[PDB]
Structure 1
Amino acid sequence: AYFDYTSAKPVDERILEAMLPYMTESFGNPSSVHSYGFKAREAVQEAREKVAKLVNGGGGTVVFTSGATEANNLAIIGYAMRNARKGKHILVSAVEHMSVINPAKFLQKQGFEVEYIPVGKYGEVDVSFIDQKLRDDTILVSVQHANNEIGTIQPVEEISEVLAGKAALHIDATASVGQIEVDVEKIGADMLTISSNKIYGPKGVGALWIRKEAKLQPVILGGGQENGLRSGSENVPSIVGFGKAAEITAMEWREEAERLRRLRDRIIDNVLKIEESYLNGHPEKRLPNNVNVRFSYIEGESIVLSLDMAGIQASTGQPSHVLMACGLKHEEAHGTLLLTLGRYNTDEDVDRLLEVLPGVIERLRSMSP
């Protein structure tokens, strides 16, 4: 029973089917000026449209990348380096993915003033902090749409109203696309990170959606693909799969989200029956697929081990920077179990989790001094 979807997902069989013809039969380079080239270019353009449409991104351009990490690097470093003449103050949430944090830290070494936005006890960013700390030399703000570790949905719409026409807003939507509504006009994104595999597309591809008139400096240099912003011969099969994923997700995500919510709530209601159990992240303003719970007197790693031994895959998340930002003590954060759900989970999976987990907690507590 697999409850580790936020670490990796399976490629939907429908997506694979769409990809395969581009591997072997129609394998052209989109830059080539012959019929094989043309078909590849047409496939890429299509795929590009399907990704844009998913997030209502007609007001900007999709840039294909090798995944969310590269796209986050491009958003943070690409925008900041390109726009540094307008100011060098940057605001980054304390609970961002490391593929946003470490680029921010790189910019600190390049002379940018990076100020981290604190979060409250459920991991919600402090919007009054952003309003207070916003300056005329603030050029960029990065706040994730939601947190993939503790599930909390961020108030990005409220943030966008604070930042309107003063600083660019980068929103990492890796955890939210296909889970909750992601409309770059509603949330006011200027840049939006998207992961292919998080919507059951192929690994190894993703995108940064960039709003019209937002200028970036490329990170990857070369033959000038992606209109100069991201060089390298197009990975047409992965792009096509990503496109198919996006189209499928546009049609199916609302139903899937409700199904996952149903399984999530079953898990949470019952797991919290365990003595001295605690939910991490917001209990309602929360991704449909996320259950993050900690247990007194226990190590998360041993839960994960015990669950593995019983054929259940899970995660725990140097303790998590996210949990520490919410104010957990070292000992509290060490007892954390992360169950993340997905397209192929069943009621039987949840039955199985719920039959095993209470005894796992009991045994590990028997061991605590």
Structure 2
Amino acid sequence: AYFDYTSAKPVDERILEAMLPYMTESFGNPSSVHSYGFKAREAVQEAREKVAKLVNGGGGTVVFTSGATEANNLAIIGYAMRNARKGKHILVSAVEHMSVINPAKFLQKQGFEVEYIPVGKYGEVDVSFIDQKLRDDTILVSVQHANNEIGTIQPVEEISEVLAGKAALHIDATASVGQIEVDVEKIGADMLTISSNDIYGPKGVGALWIRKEAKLQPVILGGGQENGLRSGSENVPSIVGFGKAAEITAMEWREEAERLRRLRDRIIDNVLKIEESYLNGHPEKRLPNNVNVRFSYIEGESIVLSLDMAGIQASTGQPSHVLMACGLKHEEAHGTLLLTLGRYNTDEDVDRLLEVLPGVIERLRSMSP
């Protein structure tokens, strides 16, 4: 029973079917000026359309990347560098993925002033802080749509309203697309990170959606692909796969999200019956696929080992920067179990988890001095 979807997902068989022809048969480079090139370009442009449509992205452009990490790098560094004339102040949430944080820290070394937005006890960003700290020289705010460790969905719509078309809003939607509604017009995104494998597409590809008129400096330099923003010969098969994932997700996500929530809730209801167990992240304003719980006296790493031995795959997330931002102590943060659900989980998988986990927790507790 696999409960580590936010670490990696299987490729849907339907996505693999759409991709394969482009590996072997129709293997042209979209820049080539012959029939194989034309077919490759048509495939890319069609994929690009499927990704944009997913997120209601007609008011911007999709730029293909090698994944969410490279897309977040592009968003942070590419926007800040290009727009530094307008100011060098950036607000970044304290619970962003390291592919936003580490680029932000790089900007700090380059003379930008990066201020981290605090979160409350459930990991929600403090919107009043953003409002108080926004300045004339604030050029960029980066707040994830939802947190993939603790499940908390962020108040991106209210953040957009605060910014009032004064600073660009970058939203990392790695955790949200396919789980909750991601409509760039509703959420007021100026840049949106999208991950292919998080929607059961292939690994090794992703996108940054960029609102019309937002200008970025490329990071990956070369032959000028992606209208200059991201060079390198297009990975057509992965692009096709991601597009096919985006079209399936558009069709299926609402149903899937409701199924995940059903499973999720069964887990949370039962796990929280264990003594001295505590849910991390908001209990309600929470991604449908996320269960993050901590247990007093126990090491999360030991829970994951013990579960692995029983044929159940899970995660434990220096302790997590997200957990520390929420105000947990080192020892609380250390007792964490992350269970993340996905397309292939069944009721039987949940049954198994719920039968095995209480005994696991009971042995580990017995070991604690």
For this structure pair, what is the TM-score category when the shorter chain's length is used for normalisation? over 0.9
C-alpha distance in structure 1 between counterparts of 2:126 and 2:355, whole Å: 39
1:265 shift after superposition: 0.2
Q: Compute the displacement of 1:165 (Å).
A: 1.1
By how many angstroms is 1:259 displaced? 0.2
Question: Aligned equivalents of 2:163 and 2:247: distance in 1?
Answer: 31
Distance 2:202 2:136 in 1: 41
Q: Deviations over 1:30-58 (max 9, x none)?
A: 00000000000000000000000000000
Deviations 1:96-139, CA, capped at 9 Å, x for gaps: 00000000000000000000000000000000000000000000
CA distance in 1 between counterparts of 2:164 and 2:279 reads 34
Partner of 1:48: 48
For 2:170 and 2:234, how far apart are their aligned partners in 1? Answer: 25
Q: CA deviation at 1:346?
A: 0.2
Shift of residue 166, structure 1, vs aligned partner: 0.2
CA distance in 2, matches of 1:61, 1:34: 26
Q: Residues 254-265 of structure 1: matches in 2 within 5 Å?
A: 254-265=254-265
What is the CA distance between 1:83 and its match in structure 2?
A: 0.1
Q: State the distance in 2 between where 1:106 and 1:224 align.
A: 25
1:297-328 Cα deviation digits (max 9, x unpaired): 00000000000000000000000000000000
CA distance in 2, matches of 1:157, 1:358: 39
> How many Å apart are 1:280 and its aligned residue?
0.1
SS at match of 1:153: coil
SS in 1 for 2:184: coil
Alignment of 1:121-200 (within 5 A): 121-200=121-200
Match of 2:359 in 1: 359
CA displacement 1:201-221 (0-9 Å, x = unmatched): 000000000000000000000
* Consecutive aligned runs of 4 or more in structure 1 exceeding 4 Å deviation: none
The CA distance in 2 between the partners of 1:80 and 1:106, in whole Å, is 11
Aligned partners of 1:132, 1:12: CA distance in 2, in Å? Answer: 45
**Residue of structure 2 equivalent to 1:90:** 90
Alignment partners' CA distance in 2, 1:165 and 1:204: 33
Could you tell me how far apart the structure 2 residues matched to 1:352 and 1:59 are?
A: 46
SS in 2 for 1:227: coil
CA shift digits 1:235-264 (9 cap, x unpaired)? 000000000000000000000000000000
1:303 matched residue in structure 2? 303
2 CA distance for matches of 1:293 and 1:319?
15
- Where structure 1 has 5 or more consecutive residues not aligned to the other structure, the ranges are none
Distance (whole Å) between structure 1 residues aligned to residue 163 and residue 16 of structure 2: 40
Whole-angstrom CA distance in 1 between matches of 2:260 and 2:195: 19
Q: Which residue of 1 aligns with 2:105?
A: 105
Return the alpha-carbon distance in structure 1 between the equivalents of residues 305 and 77 of structure 2.
Answer: 38
Instruction: Give, in angstroms, the shift of residue 267 of structure 1.
Output: 0.1
Please give the secondary structure, in 2, of the residue aligned with 1:291: strand
| Structure 1 counterpart SS, 2:368 | coil
Mapped partners of 1:326, 1:146: distance in 2: 14
Q: State the alpha-carbon separation in 2 of the partners of residues 88 and 308 from structure 1.
A: 46
User: Residue 77 of structure 1: CA displacement?
Assistant: 0.1
What SS does the aligned partner of 1:194 have? Answer: strand
**Superimposed CA distance per residue, residues 140-184 of structure 1 (whole angstroms, 9 cap, x where no aligned partner):** 000000000000000000000000210000000000000000000
Per-residue deviation, 1:16: 0.1
CA distance in 1, matches of 2:136, 2:222: 34
Compute the displacement of 1:23 (Å): 0.1
Pairwise CA distance, 1:227 = 0.1
Give the CA deviation at 1:12. Answer: 0.1
Q: Is there any run of 5+ residues in structure 2 with no aligned partner, and where?
A: none
d(CA) in 2 for partners of 1:334, 1:356: 21
Q: Determine the C-alpha separation between the residues in 2 that align with 1:164 and 1:217.
A: 24
Q: Distance in 2 between matches of 1:205 and 1:126?
A: 32
Task: Give secondary structure in 2 for the equivalent of 1:239.
Answer: helix
What is the correspondence of 1:222-233 to structure 2 with a 5 Å cutoff? 222-233=222-233
Cα deviation, 1:51-99, whole Å, max 9, x if unaligned, reads 0000000000000000000000000000000000000000000000000
Give the Cα separation in 2 of the matches to 1:10 and 1:312.
16
> Displacement, 1:356?
0.2
Aligned to 2:322: 322
1:211 & 1:196 partners in 2: Cα distance?
A: 20
1:202 is aligned to 202
Which digits, 9 at most, give the CA deviation of each residue in 1:10-30, with x for residues without a partner?
000000000000000000000
Secondary structure at 2:186 match in 1: coil
CA distance in 2, matches of 1:223, 1:178: 33
User: 2:45, 2:126 → 1: CA distance?
Assistant: 39
Percentage identity across aligned positions? 100
Q: Tell me how far apart the structure 2 counterparts of residues 13 and 132 of structure 1 sit (CA, whole Å).
A: 48
